[PDB]
Design a protein around this ligand. Structure first.
Ligand SMILES: CCCCCCCC/C=C\CCCCCCCC(=O)O[C@@H](COC(=O)CCCCCCCCCCCCCCC)COP(=O)([O-])OCC[N+](C)(C)C
Ligand SMILES: NS(=O)(=O)c1ccc2c(c1)[C@H]1C=CC[C@H]1[C@@H](c1ccc(Br)cc1)N2
Lengths: 394, 394, 394, 394, 394
């Protein structure tokens, strides 16, 4: 009975186009806040952040006021979209096809005219995502809210601290914070401020998943490529081992491609690491070909250069701590024996070439081991957030 | 004739903004229940549960009452969306872009004013999905429903047991249950309860599919990696076998990647199993390289260390139960015979090195077999739901 | 002039909320039929059938009647959505986010009040898809239609045979039929029937595509795995051939994964066939390792067991139809000759071990050939729809 | 001033439900045409054509006429959707979830009452796509337009030639033409025609992309499989080469799968070509195994059959244009010499078996080369649109 | 109070169908501009450009004017969609399913009647994307805006320079510019211009990403294919190396396929480069087979042709700077010695054939190296935007 009377009375002559101030010259203060419930996606290709957010607006409607003594029991009223004035606060940097992502809920008012509007939404905002340090990258995404058409002398936008009590932690992104700031922009024409409220979402990429799917597989496959330098040449499998390791890295690249960013503004950190690892596997195959050249050197070819015999068989090999009828029968038998002696000399020459091959495998083992470790440590620790990341995620 | 008169009479002065109670001070009891028809998806990346659900609301409208004697034949009426008051019960933790997923069906009322509202919908709710024990994981997803704007003294929300008679069993998830609970939240300002109804969907992952696509392939490929230790070195195919098995696991990883979860909150169980299996295949290739080093050992190199000949050729080899002119012609022929004797001594030394290689293959066969079995059994049975899962799904 | 007058007259006092019967106690008969134009998708993961369907409803509106003599030329009228009463027939088991998939076309009425409503739509219905016999599976998907709120004493739903004259044959599914049935459900409270009309779409999976992309490739790759038993051991390529065939099957699995169903309610038929084929390829690699063990057996090792020489060299090998100074020079020359004789004896022993290896390759060739044929024939012909399928599709 | 007066005057008593004819017995002629701007997609799995099309409708509204002398300056008026009568022409075979894909633009009318309606849209129509001759296939997709509810005596649909001046050429489909035809369907009840306008889009698949991604790669990989017959057996790499070529074709199949059609109504042309090529690569591996059997034939095994020595070493090999103390020392030395002579005889036998292997490689080289060329030429030129396609696209 | 009075006064007798000019014969000038915020996607398959754009329209409404002295404090008013007249400017070449992508914001008017309309939107326009020079391609995409129904004598469209102050740089596309142009089209019927405003977006593809994912991997894998010519034939791994490199390129093609364009209007630049590289790897395998033919040439076969011994062993080999009882014992021993001499002659012949094989590997090394460099440099530098691209992106 009383709310029937009240609802009839409140909408008599009410115009939802009218900003509800007693004095049209005075501004209408609107309190704007938000509540972040979820980070949904960070699209680095489309440069868009998707978030679950409940916006919180509050103001005072001069017309929706009543004496609670004349309508006992009726402390609040609800108005659906389009029936009363609402602040036209929109996300300026919206990247949604609808532009307005909010679900228009009812406006709750109490007897004194204080209106509360709690529109939920799944927002999509344009955010520049810098993947230079991927996967140890920290992103700062702005959410800029403001009145589409009212200036600061008509709509006095005020900010309140964002609520994160209901935030559901993301599995891929760590929320550093959601700080907010009120700013005013001025047009050179006029002296009216134009206010906006910007919330800067700072979020850190969790790196455990990437540690086990990109960093480790690349270290361990790189190690198996170094194993070629320990395989004896007589096996006849050095090329098989090395070339098949390279193939495994190509097949690996397929898995890596689904999670690596596709940009041309910079070479990500992990792209420098993956490329580095594959040049070292490629160069190990190249060094293996040279080693086989030495091992299979034809004994009747070119005599071991003097420099080859010094730089390898002496210096490097030390540093590495390696180390009538009767007369006719005589002629026939002297030929057989001399043939065998020539074979022995040829085999001795081949043994020197084979030992040189061994020495080059140990030099390359040592050099490639050092070079892989230096690149791995240097590339990963060049990230400013490496230490913090590993400490928090591992 | 009579329903024409009745429909005209029921909407005279009716305001769909008005909560329909005779006393505005008294609360309006709303009975809320749901009916779960289908679990559609459990998105562990976006942390969203999609379900097919028919909500069931009931209340009493003080204004929609008529004497069935004055309108014979007219026992019920139907009102479409927006024509009469409805409870504003919404899914609080909705993750839908529309926020409100319900299809607004007609409200059925009978002569005494009892209204039944059966809105169907495909709901998307935010649910934290813990994949620590994947694929033997049990998930608990909450569905929290409540009035958007009414407090407990105006809208007295009451719960009824969820209906699962129409539930269609899912092929991927086993429905443990859908228990419900009514709760009240209080603001420190005031003494009015704010009620909500939460339905907790508990669902168990069926593991048969994962048993045949991840667990078994990994066991059987791991077994083929152990086969390198049985392959004789003279084949010249040990590295080929072992390295190609590793490649097959990389290609396998591709299939596994489509179904494995991508999170950084924990290493899933199956990720520990897959990683474990691949370190053992990688280490078998490493051990094979060492074995080939022994088998192709140069006979004129370093004499078998004393420790090598004891730790291997004696202890391990026992535990494994293995085991003028005439004088000139004399000189020419004595050289030929002595050359052959030197060859025999060299070949005998090589045979010892080759037998040592055999012994290391049996040690590694035994050790790697034990270590694969222990890791497989230990990793899979570390799941609290392993026994139950295997009993129900296999 | 006349239709202007008529349209004005027909909507005077008309209420689209009113069921249009002269007697509110009498039921309003609605004739319901459908027309199936296309099967669009059979989602076995989401358990949803998508179909192109034109629904056909007919009833009689007591109020939309006119004398065609008083409005010459005006034989029919059209009313858009919301202007006149319509039956609230909905798909009960709808799996669409909109729930109502129909496009609301105009209601055509003639002078006697007979209304025809032909709403088109792309419907999504929840259908349990049993993939036990994939790809020789027949599916039965129900389409249950009924009034959302009217009981059988108010809305007398009647069925007519579904129209399939306009059906466009699907490339993946063969339409067996679309039989319909009217049923009544009773509540224990009351004696009013609640009718519904269910159309059961029976559709058979066409198997030609699967015959050329899964069945054949698996037979032919399985055959190439058997070819290892024909490759002589001296090639040094048995392991290479066998292990690379297994890899090709893993790469094949990738193609197969895109079209195989992902369920845990049963192991599909094709999953049993693919698994079977890969265990036999895996076991051929295992048998090859054993064969190489025999072929490279060290001649100075363990004497061929007595049982080995009988079970293989005799029985299986028969069944398979296989089969001063002068004296010093004497000593030097007698050693050379005796060394050669020892070599010949050692080589003879090795030849027996090599022939045993040959015999095991023929046994395994024969056994594996038989076992592959039996599994292929047995697994595929275990499908109840195998004969029919092959006869209609090949 | 004048258009204000005119707009007020034109909608006085206007009913948008009324077909706007002075005589309700006379039909209202509607001129229907379309303008094709783009072919967007040809979905052969879902059997749907997506096109960008601007429909063009024209008619005469008897009520929207005014004297341009009484409203100077007002030559035309615009009416938005729902304000005036429009023809209910819809795409009959629409495959869109909205069914009606048009964007409802304003209706332009001039002083004489001639209305022009230019609704744009992205249309989805159901088209049977026959991929028997893929990628040399020509498709004919119908677009059938008609009034949903009006018969030919009320709405006289007339056709005009489709406009293709604004057509943007597609990169995948060549537009042969868009011919249109007006037809009338009769119901046996009645003598009123029911007209429709059907536009048949004929489009030819461009084949350049498929020439470089499917046809060529398959020819060149097939050639590399033939290279096994030129590789000498002593390399020990024939199986490696052949088996790795087969693997490369499996990996190739992956790329081919993304662009090949998935149907069971026929085996496409390119599926016959790809299958053919892979049976020939598979059979080359089989023939290689036989060749190795000959090359490694044990010299102490079965004597070259008489037929083998004739069919190969003579006929095929011609067609291919190939081609006390002292006495003791005598005994010791006579054994050494006789041992060597036996070795020479054994080696001579082996040389015959090795030459037979060479002859079989040349026969197979020649035969497989011929058979690959015949299948390639025969399969591709069996397409009725092959010559035209290659001439226009290459 | 004053804005309530004003809003009531402004909509008295206002018709949003009326073009708001004091003189219906005079045109209404509309100022049209846009603001480009983001390039979202360049779909070269669907030929569609997606952009984030805020349109800017301005005009003068003759009816929305008021004296600011009679309504103090009320300087501006806002009107939502449908309440006042708006220009019907649409994107002519829209490729959106909605056709109209704008979000209809409020129209801001001031006391003098100047209306500002700032509709945001995510636009999809049809743009022909020429990928002939991919990835060094520059695209020109037009955005054509105009009134749907008004001619130039009723709606005088005027252009203003596009605003790019808020443009967010894209990671894949470099914005060269957004120049605009006003044009008039005439119908031969009449002398009224029909104006439109076209904005031509010129954008350059950034090539850093493609440099590291397509250009480099193809160079480095091509280099590893050249390494076969340095591998000695005795290794028995030349075919293994070469054939596995080809496989790695096939697996590589998979990654390349996701980013390469699929068109039949031309062969892109990168498709010519990738094809070129793979023909050279294929031909290296072919040349390797020929080399092995020489190396394993049977010594008792065909004598080195005279031309072979000149073209290779002399010219090319120079250019490349390469280079009673007693008598019985005599007979037995003379046979042994002569057997060895025959072996030496046979081995000498084989050495010539093996040296010829070496010479062919160096010729092919040199020739293939030159041919790879020429094709790489020639194909990439044939792009008109190569120099500029590399200078700006690397
Ligand atoms: C058509 C396809 C090919 C079909 C068949 C294989 C062709 C090779 C075998 C026949 C040729 C001769 C031969 O080698 O015979 C062998 C025996 O022969 C058998 O007993 C084997 C027959 C069954 C083969 C099963 C595997 C299918 C091959 C996979 C198909 C993959 C297809 C993939 C296509 C995409 C051995 O030769 P032999 O000289 O007889 O024995 C020595 C006798 N001795 C010891 C007594 C002296
Ligand atoms: N996606 S996953 O389940 O996290 C997954 C699956 C397999 C796998 C890993 C992760 C990595 C984590 C540890 C081993 C490492 C990788 C690997 C690479 C080379 C060698 Br040698 C051995 C092992 N194996």
């Amino acid at each position: 009975e009383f709310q029937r009377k009240l609802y009839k009375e409140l909408v008599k002559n009410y115009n939802p186009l009218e900003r509800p101030v007693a004095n049209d010259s005075q501004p209408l203060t609107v309190y704007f806040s938000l509540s972040l419930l979820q980070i949904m996606d960070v699209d680095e290709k489309n440069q868009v952040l998707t978030t679950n957010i409940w916006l919180q607006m509050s103001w005072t409607d001069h017309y929706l006021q009543w004496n609670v003594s004349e309508y006992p029991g009726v402390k609040t009223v609800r108005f659906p979209d389009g029936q009363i004035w609402k602040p036209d606060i929109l996300l300026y940097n919206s990247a949604d096809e609808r532009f307005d992502a909010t679900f228009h809920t009812n406006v709750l008012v109490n007897s004194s005219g204080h209106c509360q509007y709690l529109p939920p939404g799944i927002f999509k905002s344009s955010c520049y995502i810098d993947v230079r340090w991927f996967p140890f990258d920290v992103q700062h995404c702005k959410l800029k809210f403001g009145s589409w058409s009212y200036g600061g002398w008509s709509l006095d936008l005020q900010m309140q601290e964002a609520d994160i009590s209901g935030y559901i932690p993301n599995g891929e992104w760590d929320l550093v914070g959601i700080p907010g700031k009120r700013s005013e922009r001025f047009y050179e024409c006029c002296k009216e401020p134009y206010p906006d409220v910007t919330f800067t979402v700072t979020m850190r990429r969790r790196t455990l998943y990437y540690g086990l799917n990109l960093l480790i597989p690349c270290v361990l496959i790189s190690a198996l490529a170094l194993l070629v330098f320990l395989l004896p040449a007589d096996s006849g499998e050095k090329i098989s081992l090395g070339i098949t390791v390279l193939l495994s890295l190509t097949v690996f690249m397929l898995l890596v491609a689904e999670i690596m960013p596709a940009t041309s503004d910079s070479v990500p950190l992990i792209a420098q690491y993956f490329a580095s690892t594959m040049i070292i596997v490629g160069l190990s195959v190249v060094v293996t070909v040279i080693v086989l050249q030495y091992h299979h050197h034809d004994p009747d070819g070119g005599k071991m250069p003097k420099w080859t015999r010094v730089i390898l068989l002496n210096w490097c090999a030390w540093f590495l701590r390696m180390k009538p009828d009767l007369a006719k029968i005589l002629e026939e038998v002297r030929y057989i024996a001399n043939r065998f002696r020539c074979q022995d000399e040829s085999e001795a020459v081949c043994s020197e070439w084979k030992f040189a091959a061994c020495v080059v495998d140990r030099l390359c083992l040592m050099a490639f081991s050092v070079f892989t470790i230096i690149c791995t440590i240097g590339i990963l620790m060049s990230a400013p957030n490496f230490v913090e990341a590993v400490s928090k995620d591992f």
